[model samples]
Target chain A: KPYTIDKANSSVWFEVKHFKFNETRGVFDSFDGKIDADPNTKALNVFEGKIDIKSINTRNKKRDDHLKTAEFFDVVKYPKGSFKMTKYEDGKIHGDLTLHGVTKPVVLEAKIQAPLQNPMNKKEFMVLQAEGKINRKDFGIGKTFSDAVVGDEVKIELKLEAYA
Target chain B: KPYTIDKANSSVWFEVKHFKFNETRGVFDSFDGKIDADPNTKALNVFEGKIDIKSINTRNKKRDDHLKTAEFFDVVKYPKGSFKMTKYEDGKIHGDLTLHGVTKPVVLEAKIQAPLQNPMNKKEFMVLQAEGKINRKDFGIGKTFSDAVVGDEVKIELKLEAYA
Candidate 1:
């Protein structure tokens, strides 16, 4: 059975340093993605969905504005940021992630649980837990505080419920 | 003696509707301005000041990003917004304000007090309070939510202290 992603409940959370001591955490609020997996062969074909770069949420009003500027995402120049799968092995997925304006391959250690029907929507769904680390500068997210405050690497987490 | 404005304490606060019940409020955090006044005439002469449209803060991350896009400030195409004074009298000041690519004459009800010497810095300073109403569409701010939530006219406030 092929299932679609429940975008409402799924999210892509990210964290980056602000100033020096503060870790500013935020997420891309809008996205659409899909998952193609064969149970028999245990072959997983996972594709990252499209994210509306304009719909980011960092809680802090000022910092969020900065992220959307050319100093960072420059969402206008790159309206859409995404991830494309490169390899999937032993429940670990590796992909090429594009952000800011740079693209790099990243490995996401993820696990998939058994599929089941959601009681509310009566739709099939599968739970996914994925995590990865990427150097922000690699993707051109290189703006940092004066010098010693923020780090270049950022950790990403994805908690998604996809239909398959 | 004319002096440059302290950008840190100066702000351009504006309120617009988002189709939602409440009006969304935001500010341009980065700006540069100058204040030239003749103590004898009390004639306040303000030159065009540069506003970093990308530095807008609307409290909400998503909305702020939308405001920074081409539909709104389009900071890239028009990196700097500006304002030049035309008239000042009876607690009111009129100016030619420009943003996004359009320029219009706007009247602001102002509350400008007499100049005072700062004890800390020993600099001559004056407090200015001004307010105006405008339509975001006139400045090419947004189309969707701007058309949906924002009313045609927006309220703007400026509380600044300039040295002279």
Candidate 2:
């Protein structure tokens, strides 16, 4: 069966090293996805999702605005990013991730919990947690900036509550 | 001379494992500090800071409120937390950390950058970065929560921009 992701109960966060000492963290506030899985075990069979790049928030308005420019995400030119899983094997999800108008293959280290019935809503739900790492340069992000100012490696994390 | 921390350029953040699968992250939005150091080298002579527990934010309103209760911070009885450094040796700052109505000795791995003149403000400023780890049980936080629910080990990061 296909399960719809509970956006209110899910989160997408990313962290990148800043100035070689501090970390710059942000979250995408808007996103949605679908998960095809076994009803009983909630094992993943397929996964697809999209994130709104304009929804990026870093707790600082100035910094967030700078990130939306051509120096980084260039959200005006590419307002949305997406991921489509091509394979799932040994707790890893192999997928094509499109960001900053570039498409590349990435692997997510994933884990999922057994399906459980929520007592309050009486809905069947499962929690899926995944993490991936990508280089900003690979996606043409921050092409004009030095890595010392904004580290190239970006760590991405996702926590999704999928309901059947 | 002592320098006052620029609150607009500084941040205090912490992360802890949640459910052994994902991390629960938060920031203390209201905080202030003073740093006493040599004018030439900016070597740390003393440091002290205060954090308002009520300012804890995890991006979720409901969870933030739950953290203010007796089960967690008990902000009514202990609305503030503090740290006072007693010694600085070999890039480590040893201090007494007061939190949740308890005090314990903690050591922060620290680094500092040389003072620079801000072109816009025409003031001398220095950046200090530090990291520390603490167990919530030591401060009586979340005393009723299982380790599996809220991990005991909390990682903390501090980035301070102090002005002369």
Candidate 3:
């Protein structure tokens, strides 16, 4: 069965160190995804998701605006960040993440909960929690900035509630 | 001499585990503070800061609104959070943090940067970076929630830029 992501109950966020002081965190207010899996076994066949770049919110307008500039995400040019799963085995999802117009292979540690049938809708729903780390430089993100200004490694996490 | 905090360049944020899955992070967008120190030695004499509870943003409106309710911060009843330094020594600042109408002693690992003279304003400025861990239960925050819903321990951090 094909599972459609419930954006209201899902979150796509990231965290990275700021000037070696503290981690700066942000979330995409808008994102969508789909999962193809076996209804009985709950075995995943494929998964894909897309994040709206302009939906990024870090609690600071100035920082958010700066992130949308050419020096960083260049949101106007590359408006979406996406991931397509290639394989899922041993609780790890191997995929290719596309950001800043570049694609790189990554692995996410997955913790998928058992499917639950909603009483009201009688739909089978499940929650997927996954986390991964990637080097921003790998996708040409903030390539011109020094490591002192922004850490290279970015931690990405997703909490998705989907139903078939 | 007294130094007034440059809130535009400062940040007060926290991180706490959510369901033992991933850290849920937030930032208070509005805060102010003052530092009393010896101009020559840059030795801190005292420090105090206040954060606006309503300024908390976690990138999720639903979550942020819940945080401002009685089960959490109760922003209407306690609109502000504060910290006052009682002592500073050995790269640590001992202080009392008042949050959710509760006050508790907390120690922060401090890293005070060297003072710099702003070329344009000719004013002396400095940045202070501090990190600390606190149990939210101590502040009576999210008291009714199970540990599985929201972890008790919270990691707090501050980056303050001030000028005299």
What DockQ, between 0 and 1, does each candidate earn? 0.02, 0.25, 0.20
lDDT score for residue B24 of model 3: 72
For candidate 1, the lDDT comes to 0.68
**Scoring model 2 with DockQ, what do you get?**
0.25
Displacement of the residue A105 alpha carbon in candidate 3, Å: 1.9
> Which residue pairs does candidate 3 place in steric collision?
none
Which segments of candidate 3 are over 4 A away from where they belong?
Answer: A1-9, A20-22, A35-45, A109-129, A159-164, B1-6, B19-22, B36-45, B89-91, B111-127, B161-164
Q: Which stretches of candidate 2 lie over 4 Å from their true place?
A: A1-9, A37-43, A111-127, A161-164, B1-9, B37-43, B111-127, B161-164
lDDT of 2 by residue, B1-164 (tens): 67888775688999887654456778998988879877575579979999999999878888889999999999999999999999998779999999998999999999887565654567877778899999999999998887766789999989887777
lDDT tens digits, residues A88-127, model 2? 8888999999999899999999888856665457787777
The candidate maximizing DockQ is 2
Q: Model 3's CAPRI class?
A: incorrect
Overall lDDT per candidate, in order of appearance: 0.68, 0.85, 0.83
Cα lDDT tens digits, model 1, A11-62, are 6877554332234456787877767876444557766667888888765467
Give the candidate number with the greatest lDDT. 2
Question: Which parts of model 1 have CA positions greater than 4 angstroms off?
Answer: A19-21, A39-42, A144-147, B1-164
Fill in the DockQ of model 3.
0.20
